[PDB]
Amino acid sequence: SGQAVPSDVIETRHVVNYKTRSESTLESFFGRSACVTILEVENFNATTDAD
């Protein structure tokens, strides 16, 4: 891939970056309970195979 960063192609000031990639770790990306299916069941007096 291209590797160049801004300091390679423009005049840059010093900027201290305190920001982290905490929320894009795999644990953070996947760290959610997701609905994967909806099942149905019933309770009634069943008189047919289908019921």
């Binding site: 801004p6 005049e11 840059t12 000031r13 010093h14 900027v15």
Partner: protein
């Protein structure tokens, strides 16, 4: 010799004198300063125009009458057409500035009246509908 009433302010090629001041306010007790590397955001080398832009610009005067209800300006809006400050402001996406605001109103020992002069952060005003 030195007096709370007598002050000189020099910025760039511009000087103000007053012989009837009342001290000076430094808003929230903090002098303006450049943006530190540990608080910086955009990463391009900034333009710091210094004396070209950091100088006294005098607006059109207004007339105080017995019927005047008052005046407002916004900053940096009031200076948007002022010399190299205006040019630097409009050639760049981003800008920051402090200000020395000097409000001037002389009369005589026989006139009376009092102006409140307020610097308001985020001076959001009501609409007229």
């Amino acid at each position: 010799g030195y007096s709370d009433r007598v002050r000189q302010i020099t910025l760039g090629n511009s000087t103000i004198t007053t012989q009837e001041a009342a001290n000076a306010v430094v808003a929230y007790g903090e002098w303006p300063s450049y943006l530190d590397d540990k608080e910086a955001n955009p990463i391009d080398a900034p333009t710091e125009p210094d004396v070209s832009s950091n100088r006294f610009y005098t607006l059109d005067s207004v007339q105080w009458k017995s019927t005047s209800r008052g005046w407002w300006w916004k900053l940096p809006d009031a200076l948007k057409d002022m010399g190299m400050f205006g040019q630097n402001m409009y050639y760049h996406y981003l800008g920051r500035s402090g200000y020395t605001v000097h409000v001037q109103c002389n009369a005589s020992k026989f006139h009376q009246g009092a102006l409140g002069v307020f610097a308001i952060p985020e001076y959001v005003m009501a609409c007229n509908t």
